[PDB]
């Protein structure tokens, strides 16, 4: 159901991506900047566990595509990504704790929502 107010939240949605993706926060983000390289990282379950692989890269690339038709969707996904983290890895491993305060920006920004 297109809305007058979905461009102006997609961009909302595409500058929180892009914050995600700043200096700013890359001493915990930079895990989450690319597909996960299972067999490069010697994760021979990982596609076992996750059926559903996401990284900003992905997002990124399917925001400059227009494939989100809104703010959920981009939000979807965002959230997919970290569940994914807390899905395959035990809860003290560094990467969750990482995962946590990135998506802590995420929420506390995406609930700045204009509308
Ligand atoms: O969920 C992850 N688990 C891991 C476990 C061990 C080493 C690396 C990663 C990893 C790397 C980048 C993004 C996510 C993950």
């Given at each position: 159901?297109?809305?007058?107010?979905?461009?102006?939240?997609?961009?909302?949605?595409?500058?929180?991506?892009?914050?995600?993706?700043?200096?700013?926060?890359?001493?915990?983000?930079?895990?989450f900047?690319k597909p996960?390289?299972?067999?490069?990282?010697?994760?021979?379950?990982?596609?076992?566990?996750?059926?559903?692989?996401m990284d900003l890269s992905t997002?990124?690339?399917?925001?400059?595509?227009?494939?989100?038709?809104?703010?959920?969707?981009?939000?979807?996904?965002?959230?997919?990504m970290?569940?994914?983290?807390?899905?395959?890895?035990?809860?003290?491993?560094?990467?969750?704790?990482?995962?946590?305060?990135?998506?802590?920006?995420?929420?506390?920004?995406?609930?700045?929502?204009?509308?």
């Amino acid at each position: 159901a297109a809305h007058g107010s979905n461009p102006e939240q997609l961009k909302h949605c595409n500058g929180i991506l892009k914050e995600l993706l700043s200096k700013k926060h890359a001493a915990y983000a930079w895990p989450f900047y690319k597909p996960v390289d299972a067999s490069a990282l010697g994760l021979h379950d990982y596609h076992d566990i996750i059926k559903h692989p996401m990284d900003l890269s992905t997002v990124k690339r399917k925001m400059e595509n227009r494939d989100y038709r809104d703010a959920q969707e981009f939000a979807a996904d965002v959230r997919l990504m970290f569940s994914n983290c807390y899905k395959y890895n035990p809860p003290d491993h560094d990467v969750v704790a990482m995962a946590r305060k990135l998506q802590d920006v995420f929420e506390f920004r995406y609930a700045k929502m204009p509308d």
